Amino acid sequence: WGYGKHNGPEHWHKDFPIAKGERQSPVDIDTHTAKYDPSLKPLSVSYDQATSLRILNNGHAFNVEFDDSQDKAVLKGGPLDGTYRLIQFHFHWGSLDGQGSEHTVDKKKYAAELHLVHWNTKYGDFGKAVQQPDGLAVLGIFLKVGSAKPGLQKVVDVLDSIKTKGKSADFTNFDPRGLLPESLDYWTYPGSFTTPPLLECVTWIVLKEPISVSSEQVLKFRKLNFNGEGEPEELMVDNWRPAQPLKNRQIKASF
Ligand SMILES: [Hg+2]
Ligand SMILES: [Zn+2]
Numbered sequence: 001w002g003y004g005k006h007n008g009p010e011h012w013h014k015d016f017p018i019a020k021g022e023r024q025s026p027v028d029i030d031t032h033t034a035k036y037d038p039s040l041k042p043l044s045v046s047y048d049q050a051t052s053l054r055i056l057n058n059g060h061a062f063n064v065e066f067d068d069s070q071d072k073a074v075l076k077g078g079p080l081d082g083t084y085r086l087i088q089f090h091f092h093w094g095s096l097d098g099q100g101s102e103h104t105v106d107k108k109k110y111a112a113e114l115h116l117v118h119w120n121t122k123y124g125d126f127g128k129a130v131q132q133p134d135g136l137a138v139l140g141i142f143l144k145v146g147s148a149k150p151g152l153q154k155v156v157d158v159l160d161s162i163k164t165k166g167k168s169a170d171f172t173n174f175d176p177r178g179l180l181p182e183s184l185d186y187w188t189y190p191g192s193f194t195t196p197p198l199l200e201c202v203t204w205i206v207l208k209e210p211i212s213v214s215s216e217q218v219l220k221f222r223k224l225n226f227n228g229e230g231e232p233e234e235l236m237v238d239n240w241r242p243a244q245p246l247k248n249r250q251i252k253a254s255f
Helices: 009-015 150-162 215-221
Strands: 043-046 052-057 062-066 074-077 084-093 112-120 136-145 168-170 186-191 202-207 211-213
Touching: 052 150, 062 150, 074 112, 084 136, 084 215, 136 215, 150 168, 150 215
Parallel strands: 136 202, 136 211
Antiparallel strands: 043 074, 052 062, 052 168, 062 084, 074 084, 084 112, 112 136, 186 202
């Protein structure tokens, strides 16, 4: 599967029939139909003891991986019951600045979207959590082009080391707090992974506030490659899935 004409999102259903299921992601967040729900608790993001281990180009995005063998970087509160551990984050971006996010807001597409992936510790490990309707919680943050995000520069500088599919580089002591916006207001709905296997395991928490990155920071993302070393070069751009039908799910807003 991939993002091209012959293997991109509109073909995915042949190998992963859940693509056409009932709670697929991403979706358009219609701000006027989203229900303010005053029972939504504030999010609690405890990332101060986070341990990053490595960054990896896996052929469809680059992932920063974290040590999830103990409760070091956890998410709780908001719509969640329980503690969700951070296992990795990755981005989706476009070839141009006006596209790249997966989720849209009143049909507006942003330049990129960050997904911080967490699994529910009640289930023991990530592989068991992906068999559950509430096994994962993913935090989505929109990126728009403006001023440089200082906390993103460590990530941008290592990307040369992992240009092609399959390469990885050690990436310790990265603090994920530098990628957070000021406000933690959010929209939340039940959804899925946005890449194969597209399992319907995810409580999505999409933050209202975007972070800004500079044009030169997001340009470095665009130099990555989908291909492995020694294969023809295919630039890793537009690795995002289009919005899916909401199908009688309701988006709740914390604000
Ligand atoms: Hg699931
Ligand atoms: Zn993602």
